[PDB]
């Protein structure tokens with residue numbers, strides 16, 4: 635931004651999207667650190683994800699906005715177009731790995747449940763980050779070696795090599811997304827089955843108590859006991875509310891994880907479908923429209939990196955109360 639030579643000033647109004655992308659994720663990072671009730675494997679995963687998304691807003695988004703200002707004619711030195719692209723390939727990938735891990739271990743938690751949690755979480759964070767780095771690192775070598783895989787028509791900074799686009803999309807989007815979807819569906823199936831036994835019998839006995847009838851209560855508690863000693867006596871508050879609250883908290887967490895995964899794939903599918911379709915027909919297609927659509931779908935995918943904190947705010951008292959108190963107390 636010299637600013638001499640700019641071409642699209644209203645694009646500066648995208649800074650708001652950037653400002654919230656960092657801060658919201660910061661609010662997650664401030665939360666999972668300063669709130670003791672957020673110290674666990676999944677919330678540490680979410681802190682890592684917030685770091686990745688804040689870095690998206692800090693490094694991937696601002697260069698894209700600067701390029702938009704100059705009408706997609708790379709305004710920075712030529713050695714920064716590869717880096718930026720690779721940084722994209724890094725941070726976004728981490729996200730789709732983190733979610734894929736969050737849905738995977740969860741499934742591996744439900745199947746065969748049986749170091750410490752706060753350390754195996756570190757191991758998984760390291761694994762997903764290393765995968766992201768391994769995907770990102772080749773891009774600068776390819777770009778700085780052959781500047782035609784990262785520059786299109788000598789001015790536009792987009793990934794150009796077809797084989798790399800396809801292979802990276804299949805190994806960084808389609809495989810992680812597929813694992814995420816399959817694991818989440820199997821998880822949400824098994825959870826319903828395990829919960830079903832207790833909730834059906836409990837509903838039977840609760841309805842029979844609601845009448846006053848009483849003869850229809852004993853077998854319900856028998857079946858619930860079979861599925862510990864809170865039902866053998868039968869009072870309703872303690873053991874019922876204890877085990878029933880544990881099930882429902884899990885249901886809420888499953889809803890949140892599904893919403894995060896689903897916002898992610900909904901917001902990133904347009905860009906990926908459009909790109910792999912722009913290469914499915916290297917000719918015979920209208921490439922101008924493909925590029926113009928991709929220039930907006932890329933930012934939809936970017937904006938996905940600032941929505942998960944709002945999901946936490948909408949479905950967590952801890953995160954919401956954190957965010958409010960952090961905003962007012964710190965400044």
Ligand SMILES: CC(C)COc1ccc(CNC(=O)N(Cc2ccc(F)cc2)[C@H]2CCN(C)CC23CC3)cc1
Nearest residue numbers: 722723726727730769772793798799802803806807932
């Ligand atoms: C040399 C090979 C191994 C690595 O080469 C690769 C090629 C493509 C991909 C798929 N990833 C993307 O298409 N992204 C990042 C992304 C990453 C992960 C996601 F889950 C979503 C998007 C877009 C995002 C928008 N940027 C402007 C350009 C882009 C970088 C290309 C990954 C690796």
